[PDB]
Amino acid sequence: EYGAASITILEGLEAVRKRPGMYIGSTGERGLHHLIWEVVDNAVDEAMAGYATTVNVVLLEDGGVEVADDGRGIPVATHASGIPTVDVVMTQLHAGGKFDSDAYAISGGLHGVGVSVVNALSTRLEVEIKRDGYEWSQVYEKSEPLGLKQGAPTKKTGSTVRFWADPAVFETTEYDFETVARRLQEMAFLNKGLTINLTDERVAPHKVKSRTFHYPGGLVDFVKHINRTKNAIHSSIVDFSGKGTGHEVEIAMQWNAGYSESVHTFANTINTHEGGTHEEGFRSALTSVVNKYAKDRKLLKDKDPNLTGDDIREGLAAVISVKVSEPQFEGQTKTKLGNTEVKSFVQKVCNEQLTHWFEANPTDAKVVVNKAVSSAQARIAARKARE
Amino acid sequence: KAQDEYGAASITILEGLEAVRKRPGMYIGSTGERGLHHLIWEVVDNAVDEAMAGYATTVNVVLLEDGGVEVADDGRGIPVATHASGIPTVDVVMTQLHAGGKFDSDAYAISGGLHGVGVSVVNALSTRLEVEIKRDGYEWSQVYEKSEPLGLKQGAPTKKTGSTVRFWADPAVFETTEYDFETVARRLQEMAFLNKGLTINLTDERVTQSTAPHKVKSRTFHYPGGLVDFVKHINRTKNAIHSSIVDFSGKGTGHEVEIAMQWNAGYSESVHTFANTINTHEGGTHEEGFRSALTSVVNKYAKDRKLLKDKDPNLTGDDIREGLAAVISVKVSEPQFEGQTKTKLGNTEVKSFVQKVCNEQLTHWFEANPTDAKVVVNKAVSSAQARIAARK
Numbered sequence: 001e002y003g004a005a006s007i008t009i010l011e012g013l014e015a016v017r018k019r020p021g022m023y024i025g026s027t028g029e030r031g032l033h034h035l036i037w038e039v040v041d042n043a044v045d046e047a048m049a050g051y052a053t054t055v056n057v058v059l060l061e062d063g064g065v066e067v068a069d070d071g072r073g074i075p076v077a078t079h080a081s082g083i084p085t086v087d088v089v090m091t092q093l094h095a096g097g098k099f100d101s102d103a104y105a106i107s108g109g110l111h112g113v114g115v116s117v118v119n120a121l122s123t124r125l126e127v128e129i130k131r132d133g134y135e136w137s138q139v140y141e142k143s144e145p146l147g148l149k150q151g152a153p154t155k156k157t158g159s160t161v162r163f164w165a166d167p168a169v170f171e172t173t174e175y176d177f178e179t180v181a182r183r184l185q186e187m188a189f190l191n192k193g194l195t196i197n198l199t200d201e202r203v204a205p206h207k208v209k210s211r212t213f214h215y216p217g218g219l220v221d222f223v224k225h226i227n228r229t230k231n232a233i234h235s236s237i238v239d240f241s242g243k244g245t246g247h248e249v250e251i252a253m254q255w256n257a258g259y260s261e262s263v264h265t266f267a268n269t270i271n272t273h274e275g276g277t278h279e280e281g282f283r284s285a286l287t288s289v290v291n292k293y294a295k296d297r298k299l300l301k302d303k304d305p306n307l308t309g310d311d312i313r314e315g316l317a318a319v320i321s322v323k324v325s326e327p328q329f330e331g332q333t334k335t336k337l338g339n340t341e342v343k344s345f346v347q348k349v350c351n352e353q354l355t356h357w358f359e360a361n362p363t364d365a366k367v368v369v370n371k372a373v374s375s376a377q378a379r380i381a382a383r384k385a386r387e
Numbered sequence: 388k389a390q391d392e393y394g395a396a397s398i399t400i401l402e403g404l405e406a407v408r409k410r411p412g413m414y415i416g417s418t419g420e421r422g423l424h425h426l427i428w429e430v431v432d433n434a435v436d437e438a439m440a441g442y443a444t445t446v447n448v449v450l451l452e453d454g455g456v457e458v459a460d461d462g463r464g465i466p467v468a469t470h471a472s473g474i475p476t477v478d479v480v481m482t483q484l485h486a487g488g489k490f491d492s493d494a495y496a497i498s499g500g501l502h503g504v505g506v507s508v509v510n511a512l513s514t515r516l517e518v519e520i521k522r523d524g525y526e527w528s529q530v531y532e533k534s535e536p537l538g539l540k541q542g543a544p545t546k547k548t549g550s551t552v553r554f555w556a557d558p559a560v561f562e563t564t565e566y567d568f569e570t571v572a573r574r575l576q577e578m579a580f581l582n583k584g585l586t587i588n589l590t591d592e593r594v595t596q597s598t599a600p601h602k603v604k605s606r607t608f609h610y611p612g613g614l615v616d617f618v619k620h621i622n623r624t625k626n627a628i629h630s631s632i633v634d635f636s637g638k639g640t641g642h643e644v645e646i647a648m649q650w651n652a653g654y655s656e657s658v659h660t661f662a663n664t665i666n667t668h669e670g671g672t673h674e675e676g677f678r679s680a681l682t683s684v685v686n687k688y689a690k691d692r693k694l695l696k697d698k699d700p701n702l703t704g705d706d707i708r709e710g711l712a713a714v715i716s717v718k719v720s721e722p723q724f725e726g727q728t729k730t731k732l733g734n735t736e737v738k739s740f741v742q743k744v745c746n747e748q749l750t751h752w753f754e755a756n757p758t759d760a761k762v763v764v765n766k767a768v769s770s771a772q773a774r775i776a777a778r779k
């Protein structure tokens with residue numbers, strides 16, 4: 001009997017617990033680690049706004065994860081809603097301070113869902129906040145607030161979010177250290193003044209497993225890192241910026257004797273690992289710049305076909321970092337940046353700055369074009385040899 | 388700065404479809420070409436879901452001149468009756484997020500729709516929406532202007548059942564509001580392949596600057612050979628290496644799988660993955676389960692027949708999948724898709740399942756057809772040694 005009785009409306013966090021995949025992709029290792037990503041993003045968002053300097057993540061013994069920032073602290077006062085803003089932010093969907101650019105000019109967070117999902121997919125969530133001249137505490141048991149508590153007075157500011165992933169939701173709740181270590185590192189690469197500390201408290205003087213991430217050389221350091229094991233082909237690491245009405249691009253790149261593509265893209269510090277408009281404008285601009293150089297330096301005949309992106313990006317270590325005041329991310333996992341205006345923006349920046357670099361550095365330009373030409377001709381030889 | 392004085396007032400709660408209008412990327416990916424087409428997917432997906440349940444036989448998609456899209460199914464009809472919340476059910480289904488009849492397995496046992504978001508999002512990102520429902524003994528008509536319902540109208544009596552949804556994309560939302568016929572065509576074609584008793588008709592009533600009948604693009608997709616008509620389609624411009632196509636299925640608790648595969652002359656991998664008819668073009672567990680199974684099956688066959696030497700390492704997936712045309716269709720009672728755009732299927736248990744079915748059933752095909760198998764193994768053996776030669 002398909003009718004009005006079959007239509008079911010979901011309320012609050014019901015929808016998150018019924019369809020975790022809509023918010024975290026899946027309940028696998030990727031989904032589990034996304035919980036950490038949601039809590040850390042909010043702390044990073046505070047650093048980007050220029051309030052936090054430090055983000056400390058701790059993998060606790062019990063499987064709990066702690067994330068502490070020295071930012072402004074989650075608004076704790078009573079909302080217009082009639083409940084303390086901590087609860088609005090922690091238990092409601094499409095609720096937050098990132099629907100404008102007033103509180104956070106450039107922020108990874110934008111849907112007002114992130115940390116609410118973490119509450120929804122956790123057995124427990126604790127929060128310790130410093131602001132309004134006090135130390136504030138709140139416990140959320142099976143997503144429900146047990147009571148906001150006004151504690152010790154303090155001039156200090158910041159937030160500390162603690163959460164315990166539901167073993168009913170996730171199959172495996174053991175977080176992976178090096179997965180977390182890798183992501184926190186890239187956040188510090190995209191945030192110059194930011195310091196991220198990581199501690200693994202899970203199982204006479206004893207030192208606990210820890211890492212510190214501070215990179216004053218930003219993206220140029222990120223590239224040096226990518227090209228440690230890989231043997232760099234040219235001395236000068238490409239580095240440039242681009243500014244526009246509503247957006248900004250930051251690029252750094254270097255080639256190596258490798259045969260793989262090591263291109264990482266970011267939008268408001270978010271790892272847009274499935275790419276997007278920013279990556280697309282970059283690839284587009286790169287292919288056209290190299291192809292013009294090779295044709296102009298007669299490294300390819302006029303009858304010779306143009307070098308494909310695959311030939312050029314082979315052995316390339318590149319980082320594309322965009323700061324967008326109004327991003328368009330593909331779902332809550334934000335695997336892609338979709339902003340159509342950002343493709344034409346990145347493209348003109350890469351076109352004008354890569355054309356500049358290739359003409360300014362003739363030594364370095366020669367090598368990377370020689371590689372592209374040699375890798376292109378190799379694929380034309382391998383296809384013919386196979387017949 | 389007012390950023391310093393950030394507190395309770397800085398936090399704002401979005402009500403209903405304001406969430407979709409503010410952050411469309413959460414539900415459609417982007418406001419680009421791919422996002423625009425996603426609006427048709429949401430509406431067609433709902434019509435297809437009715438075919439999957441065995442109530443709809445036909446789906447008719449029309450790209451209107453004005454710029455609107457019309458999707459007509461002969462299903463059961465979007466329930467019209469006044470919902471428990473106090474308003475007609477159509478209005479709940481069209482103006483409210485996380486509301487639908489796909490949260491259980493009662494109305495739709497297997498369905499691509501699962502979030503209760505689809506058609507509400509379409510309504511949210513459209514200047515106007517129009518619904519024509521035939522059910523409960525009468526033909527009904529509702530109109531939404533900027534998502535707001537103008538009032539449900541009751542019409543003439545009918546014994547027939549179906550739904551007709553018509554939407555006009557908001558140009559303020561989308562950079563481009565003009566659809567690509569081939570994009571729509573290709574998709575509706577794959578939908579017809581994965582649903583044996585379904586017929587999808589696409590019609591293009593958009594003119595170009597007289598109105599001769601041949602100037603209107605049209606398609607009618609009905610494939611009784613399902614996935615086999617799909618692999619036959621894939622290897623058309625390409626040339627098959629073995630005569631008979633690999634056709635096999637396999638069921639489990641709360642999941643079913645269908646595989647159809649064939650190898651071509653090229654070095655081009657053409658593996659298409661589907662979950663509840665949804666094109667999971669980024670793959671997921673079902674694909675990964677198949678990829679694992681396929682690599683293991685060929686490596687056990689190449690070693691036993693001694694086609695591959697003991698000295699050389701095992702074959703890579705890429706060399707096996709080189710020139711492979713395959714279709715992977717899973718039917719899952721409780722799926723887990725990455726977001727609204729549903730680009731990936733992430734069910735942990737599906738990787739084990741598809742691999743279990745593939746490992747067992749492919750081994751069966753290799754053992755029963757040694758003649759066709761030798762050609763396949765010989766292709767992978769040469770392409771692996773080609774990859775080794777290229778590295779030198």
Ligand SMILES: Nc1ncnc2c1ncn2[C@@H]1O[C@H](COP(=O)(O)OP(=O)(O)NP(=O)(O)O)[C@@H](O)[C@H]1O
Pocket residue numbers: 038041042043046069071072073074075089095096097098108109110111112113114115116159398
């Ligand atoms: N560590 C924090 N410091 C200060 N404010 C925070 C912090 N964490 C959360 N908030 C506030 O709570 C709001 C909502 O967070 P959240 O639930 O993650 O959604 P969001 O960050 O706005 N967007 P999104 O992450 O894309 O879903 C934020 O806008 C912040 O204002």
Ligand SMILES: Nc1ncnc2c1ncn2[C@@H]1O[C@H](COP(=O)(O)OP(=O)(O)NP(=O)(O)O)[C@@H](O)[C@H]1O
Pocket residue numbers: 429432433434437460462463464465466480486487488489490499500501502503504505506507508550
């Ligand atoms: N053509 C139709 N025929 C009958 N019922 C429909 C039709 N279209 C929508 N519905 C019903 O309306 C509900 C809401 O639609 P929708 O917004 O697309 O959410 P959904 O299909 O459940 N899931 P999803 O598409 O993944 O967000 C559906 O679940 C159906 O119950």
Ligand SMILES: [Mg+2]
Pocket residue numbers: 098099100101104105106107325
């Ligand atoms: Mg913002």
Ligand SMILES: [Mg+2]
Pocket residue numbers: 038041042109110113114115
């Ligand atoms: Mg957030």
Ligand SMILES: [Mg+2]
Pocket residue numbers: 442443461462463547548549
């Ligand atoms: Mg019917």
Ligand SMILES: [Mg+2]
Pocket residue numbers: 429430432433500504505506
């Ligand atoms: Mg739908």
